[PDB]
Symmetry: C10
Subunit: 57 residues, 10 copies
């Protein structure tokens, strides 16, 4: 569906990030230079940006 997020919906997604509920996909080494995809928790720097945006709203 063609969807445009409205203001409250932006804040709901930002809230999930801030609360530590989201992950992101990165490459992880598995030996000798080979890598696999994996998910990690979203980093503090990103959570803080989400909080900073929430606090401005």
């Amino acid at each position: 569906e063609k969807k445009i997020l409205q203001a409250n919906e932006v804040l709901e997604h930002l809230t999930r990030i801030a609360l530590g509920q989201e992950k992101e996909q990165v490459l992880m080494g598995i030996g000798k230079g080979a890598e696999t995809k994996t998910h990690v928790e979203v980093s503090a720097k990103d959570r803080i940006k989400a909080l900073e945006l929430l606090g401005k709203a």
Copy 2:
């Protein structure tokens, strides 16, 4: 030729923000050799898309 309109810009930003998009990056396959693969758009990029959608 296509110029994306203001609403079209917000729709693409939304796809990104909602985690529906990928980007192509290089992944190690061993001994320095790499291959092209797709990964999810990173949180930092999603947060940028959210930030712009909040300014809409």
Copy 3:
């Protein structure tokens, strides 16, 4: 569908500032292999939280 209220933003920033949070990172385990682990949030990120708390 939660939206963090003003107080709740500051409470979260406080947890970070006070050194109570961690972040998940990749740590080398030899010859290119890595494992996920948690490390304390960095001083740079804590100081940003402190700066935000000082403005509030």
Copy 4:
């Protein structure tokens, strides 16, 4: 000598934003050796294009 006009700039940013453009990068093929290859334009760059498109 050509100068890209207003509408032309937006046409080019649109191709980028839509995921239709590539860039040439260096990819490993083993033991330090690299080859030139094309990859999709990254999400960060698409986001910049979408931002510029949204502000015109």
Copy 5:
């Protein structure tokens, strides 16, 4: 209702002071060999201490 902790203005300054006075550490990954790492704590860096000092100067 349980009122969770929000750091107060004086307390932000007290934490920044600890940092600026060189009394704080952060956890980093340190190399131990062959691509392997271990966790250790290091003194907060001069760059971070200067950011703290700057914020203290303005407060």
Copy 6:
């Protein structure tokens, strides 16, 4: 001698934007050894040239 004037600036940015230019980069040839080679101008740099062309 030559000072580029405003239109000449826009002509050069136009070449960059249209993907007609290259830059010289160091490419790996094995075991740390490198060679000077040329690759297309990157999307980030093309987008900067587009941004500048749109502001004119």
Copy 7:
């Protein structure tokens, strides 16, 4: 408990004068590292000079 303006300037001065150190990781071979102290960098000392000049 809280550094006041003058103590801030004293601390920035120490840094600007090249009297301060910071802890960093130094290689000791084969990927291993040890913690050591190094003089605070020129970039940092210049930031401190900049803040001192605006005092």
Copy 8:
């Protein structure tokens, strides 16, 4: 090589122009194998050319 020369306005723009037109190079370190490096010259990068162009447009 006069050590006390000061560039005039038009000489600044002449120098930026040489950069923009791809006439200049910079000295960088290039790998020659097993960690050994040599000094070499490369063309000025597109990023630096674009900054020179931007400056010329701001004149």
Copy 9:
């Protein structure tokens, strides 16, 4: 420790030393197989230019 505060004039004298190429900074230098030693190197151009920028504004 022996406390001191730099005055406006001392700020400029120390920037001038940097800008004139008279100062050094400590860095780590490789000595082989990943091992490093401390060494002193001249202050970099980028840092001398920032000093010159500040001196120019004063």
Copy 10:
């Protein structure tokens, strides 16, 4: 205990802009060993010097 005069700032900036200055860097000589060497000041730094001279 010199303080650079305004003209002396510009003279120094001019040396850099004209390609006459060098900076000291570390250069690999093999197996991880490095040596101090001098290289020309980079284009990015020459361009900054140019920008500052242009504002004078």
